[model samples]
Target chain A: EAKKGIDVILLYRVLKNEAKEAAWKMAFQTEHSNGKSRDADSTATKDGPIQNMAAIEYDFSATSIVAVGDKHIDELDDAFDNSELVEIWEIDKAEKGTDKDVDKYKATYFQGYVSSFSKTPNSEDALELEIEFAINGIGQKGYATLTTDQAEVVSYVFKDTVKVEE
Target chain B: EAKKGIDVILLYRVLKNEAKEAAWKMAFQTEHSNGKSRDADSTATKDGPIQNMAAIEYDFSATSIVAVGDKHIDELDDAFDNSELVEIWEIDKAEKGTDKDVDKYKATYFQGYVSSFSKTPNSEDALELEIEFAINGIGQKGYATLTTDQAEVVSYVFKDTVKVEE
Candidate 1:
């Protein structure tokens, strides 16, 4: 018997072009709804996204380019694990090159993420879930070269949920 | 009246295997007077030639990649009118995206020897020669991306020569 149980789920995805677009729209809409659009010219407009803005600004900061490589853990867990407690760790590694030959390069740091999950005690029916995660701390030393395609792959893994508690 | 001068001319040429062997033979050979191995090592041996033993070290200084398009003369004198002199000047204006596009660039300042003398006294034999100059300070500015091939072209004008009376 657990009393006053509060399970905090922290999920994230690598930021791609689609995710960046979604984040920008979300930020703009949130600002507009809170009556913060009175000085519209001060903010970045959808038409000219880069005008009068910081050169290094991004929609999300914690996104990882390598994290996008692991995108299919949620579906795999739901089909095989019989809805038990599971934690899917999505890991990615990449290399950055300083010379002309990519083979002679240095390995970059690895990024990891956990899939989203829902809590259920002795559930009779299987759970179908739709999850969304935000990327942060991106554009650092190693993650600058993440392409749009790579980011998409990393986001899929984080969207899947695995039950951590039964 | 010519002044006594001691100039060491260092000439270099990229040679293949065959050319290097021929050059080494010609540079180290000695004439034999008696036949009892008289200066035998002078031509084929290693430590015989004193001049050749004078510390042969390779100089690998980064060359200037800046290209010289043309030169203009601001002033000329009658006494040394035919003499070739190289003058370094700070460019005031440069074309956009050129090596001279910056405020200052590396330039070689030296006078060259002219083989012949001017026939006429007042005949202006003003010559504008095109040369390839190197830019040395690029790597210091983190602008190594603009290398010798990517350097922009700039123009320079020479000022009046200051001649000392003998």
Candidate 2:
């Protein structure tokens, strides 16, 4: 079964807020892409080719509309502008009952600060915000289940050892 | 003086066309960013750490709107989808008399193919096209001046040794 882009949900939570509902909200993003790259330091050993120094960087782009005074936009911009820490969560929703027993959902949790918040407006279209979110440390992949009592939320059972289904 | 984003002009030309007038058109991009990265293969020799194997990559993203049937969009999409080569040019328009002696403009000429062209549309906004243009091997940085007799065109004096102003 093919998954749709809408299945990818990006949520953000303020570092100061304790309550999940008040803290986490939809990021209001239109499209996003992530990348993992490392500098492979290499050298010429005695009769051998070598590669090393895997200094990896995890980064992603979250592009959306610039809705002034909106909670998500304001907090995101503030975090990027003021160098504040923010929590970013990306959920990949699986087909319903695909894994009939577990009904699992895949998610990636990142703790970092926004690196860039570029606002570009054209007269022919709406104001666009292109944000670069960089992961400070290691990002984790886990499993979760979706819930929405009042606001959209995902409950995660995180473990680096957690085995996820394809 | 700080340069504005509007001064960056991105234009394109269909590879098959010979005439510059009918072949080149403005890409109508909102924003673009370029990156140059390499894999530094390293090793721990007897004396100290070492680095080598500098395989560099030049890539850029051109984000624009999805205007149906537009010449630039159609050519870009067809090139990306059909696995064809396209010429991408990026011009940095300098201040009107900054270099009073020469009054030259900075430009980058690349011969490459689009690696990816993603079209995304949300109900609340207009259609968006995010394209990744990767340089085949080497991209040339040269000097030129702008002209518009009938349509947007740039006449270049090709020299990899061309000197540009700040």
Candidate 3:
């Protein structure tokens, strides 16, 4: 069975290097990829060991409304000229037994920077913000138990990191 | 004088390495950054040598509508798994001798690939495609003289590559 879109969530925040008090914001219309590649082999007989490329390339894209002078825009404006530290989190609601109640989740953390960004404001419509974040290292996956008290995440505990091997 | 949004054009296409027949498409709600960052100096106080960072980091983001099975989506779907060659062009109308008539133009070319992308479809409104592109190298600038009989780049000549230096 396919999962609903609500089962997955995307969140982002400026890293401590830039904003010490930055809060996490939900990223809408989010899309991302973790890519690894191998070069064409010239000495291949029939089958050979594929050579994996070094450094996984991570990229993220998302849509947002433009808010002039807002922290989101302000941080992007300052970071646009350079690569500033940024962090992203992707959470998936994990199935917890037969009971419908669930608090356990899977999360992937990406520590990265914004490579570039742009904003377009149309007179007829809302201002659109386009963000492109470049991940610094490989994504780290962890299990978390989160509790929500209204619309906000009230408590959460992330335990254990799954070892990622190239 | 502040120019209107129509003065600048952003265009993109699958590069020759991937698609030989791909056509240029306009990127809506576009945002991008051409960024260069230098290391913090541990040796500098008064006035010392400021070293420039090697290699510019380029990132681009844009919004689009979801068209299932369309060339745009198909290209992105295939490219999403790995880095695929893509090309982008940014054109600007150069000021001509003030009859309000102009044909001279400037264009910047970016050859890159999509690192990540996301699409959001809402039941209330239109489908949104968020694209993130990673540029491979430094942008190349050129001058062009274009003629438009209708609303197309009918004829044009790109004369000379402006030598770009670090």
In terms of TM-score, the best-performing candidate is 2
lDDT of 2 at A110: 86
DockQ of 3: 0.04
Q: Global lDDT for candidate 1?
A: 0.23
Off by over 4 Å in 1: A1-57, A60-133, A138-166, B1-166
Please give, for residues A16-72, the per-residue lDDT of candidate 3 as tens digits: 554455445543343444354434534445677555443233446666654322445
- Cα RMSD for candidate 2? 20.4
Using DockQ as the measure, name the better of candidate 1 and candidate 3: 3
Worst 10 residues of 3 chain B by lDDT: B36-45
In order, what fnat does every candidate score?
0.00, 0.03, 0.03
User: Candidate 2, overall lDDT?
Assistant: 0.64
Sorted by DockQ, highest first, which candidate order results? Answer: 3, 2, 1
Q: How close is candidate 3 to the true structure, as a TM-score?
A: 0.40
Q: Is candidate 2 or candidate 3 better by TM-score?
A: 2
Tell me the docking grade of candidate 2: incorrect
Q: lDDT tens digits, residues B33-63, model 1? A: 1111112223444655442232111111111
**Which docking class does model 1 fall in?**
incorrect
